[PDB]
Design a protein around this nucleic acid. Structure first.
Ligand SMILES: [Ca+2]
Ligand SMILES: [Mg+2]
Ligand SMILES: [Mg+2]
Length: 430
DNA sequence: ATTTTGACGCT
DNA sequence: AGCGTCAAA
């Protein structure tokens, strides 16, 4: 009771751009705005693979990973924007640069952890304390929270979505204890005010809309974010966790969407996150290991301590290309030419990175896949990255992989290569 | 024949 | 160091 830590010590937000690559293309081409549209890579095979989908097109059932020919079967008027191709491969530069726009805006408000090209965690604890001091116990107006949902509300004794949103927000604000600067619910509420301001700044200065979750840790913030998409933000309080988790499939919590979450379900014979509360910490550790067991015991109670790491820039810079089916590289000069294309894109991005961010990569990671291999990577080998030189980098990658060739033949390559991947890693300040 | 990414844990 | 997991668009 009095010594039971409740995981209410921080205010953490997760901001995620809505249908991000689509929004980048729609900002560039106004003909695509407010339309069912998608972003596609390549075009020859089945119209290209869809990698992002507007909410208008999602209403027709269009999804990511769909071939555009099939998506057009669901959505005959679907508009498409193609990823740029350079040196024979898809090139994501436009989206990386849009991401920088958004991340630099967010960093004005607080320390951020770049979580992916279009999402960042925000540690708002300090900013919240300062805003609380400036407000002088003044109550928080619903007008400061015009796109915020309070998960779990309204409850107790309208048929429209905005009307529900407002009633729950009213109930929340009417219950708030604003005279206590230490109340975690008030801190989350002020966090939500700041996130409204952050999201307005992002939209004003880029045109991009986003959603956000606000809660006491990264996992709950990430979950909250997805509850009301697009263009809305959701506050998940500590008190909301029991009800929220009671029907929440385990696979919806970050890191449990894969094999571990499957084993939790299988071994324990449960379906929802809240059912985890009925096991002791030692039981969970026995099944899933010391670290996972401790994490699960705390997480099913809404508690998690993983910090928002101060890192706005990616730690690796990589280029990769698949060679599916019959395109798999079967000659030496094929392998070498594609290694060079990858190395040239890598050198461009690396030189830009060094100029912008005062750092130099020191290691080159070469990874390949062989035809008929189960895994995504069949082999991974490192070498020194000493010069931002695409010919040297491609030569060194070839040197470290040349020995994979089972061909007794000079020119030929066997087994054929279905994937090449060059990654620059191990950055040092420059 | 989703493809092209990025972070982190285990041994 | 190399492999595997989990996740983004
Ligand atoms: Ca997104
Ligand atoms: Mg995202
Ligand atoms: Mg997504």
């Amino acid at each position: 009771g009095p010594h039971m830590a409740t995981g209410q010590d921080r205010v953490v937000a997760l901001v995620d751009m809505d249908c991000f690559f689509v929004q980048v293309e729609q900002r560039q081409n106004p003909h695509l705005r407010n339309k069912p549209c998608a972003v596609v890579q390549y075009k020859s095979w089945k119209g290209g693979g869809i990698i992002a989908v507007s909410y208008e097109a999602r209403a027709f059932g269009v999804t990511r990973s769909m071939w555009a020919d099939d998506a057009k079967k669901l959505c005959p008027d679907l508009l498409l924007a193609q990823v740029r191709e350079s040196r024979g491969k898809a090139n994501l530069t436009k989206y990386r640069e849009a991401s920088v726009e958004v991340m630099e805006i967010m960093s004005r408000f607080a320390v951020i952890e770049r979580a992916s090209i279009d999402e960042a965690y925000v540690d708002l604890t300090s900013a919240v304390q300062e805003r609380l001091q400036k407000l002088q116990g003044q109550p928080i107006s619903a007008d400061l929270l015009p796109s915020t949902y309070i998960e779990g509300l309204p409850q107790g004794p309208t048929v429209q979505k905005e009307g529900m949103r407002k009633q729950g927000l009213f109930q929340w604000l009417d219950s708030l204890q604003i005279d206590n600067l230490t109340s975690p619910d008030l801190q989350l509420t002020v966090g939500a005010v700041i996130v409204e301001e952050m999201r307005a700044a992002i939209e004003r200065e880029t045109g991009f809309q986003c959603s956000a979750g606000i809660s006491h840790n990264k996992v709950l913030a990430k979950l909250a974010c997805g509850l009301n998409k697009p263009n809305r933000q959701t506050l998940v309080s500590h008190g909301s966790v029991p009800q929220l988790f009671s029907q929440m499939p385990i696979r919806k919590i970050r890191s449990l969407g894969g094999k571990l979450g499957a084993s939790v379900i299988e071994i324990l014979g449960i379906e929802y996150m809240g059912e985890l509360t009925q096991f002791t910490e030692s039981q969970l550790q026995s099944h899933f290991g010391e670290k996972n067991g401790s994490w699960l015991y705390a997480m099913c109670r809404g508690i998690e301590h993983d910090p928002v790491k101060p890192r706005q820039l990616p730690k690796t810079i990589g280029c990769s290309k698949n060679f599916p089916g019959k395109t798999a590289l079967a000659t030496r000069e094929q392998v070498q030419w594609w290694l060079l294309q990858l190395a040239q894109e890598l050198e461009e991005r690396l030189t830009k990175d060094r100029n912008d961010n005062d750092r130099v990569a020191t290691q080159l990671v070469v990874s390949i896949r062989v035809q008929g291999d189960k895994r995504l990577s069949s082999l991974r080998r490192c070498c020194a990255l000493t010069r931002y030189d695409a010919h040297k980098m491609s030569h060194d990658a070839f040197t470290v992989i040349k020995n994979c060739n089972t061909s007794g033949i000079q020119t030929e390559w066997s087994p054929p290569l279905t994937m090449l991947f060059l990654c620059a890693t191990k950055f040092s300040a420059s």
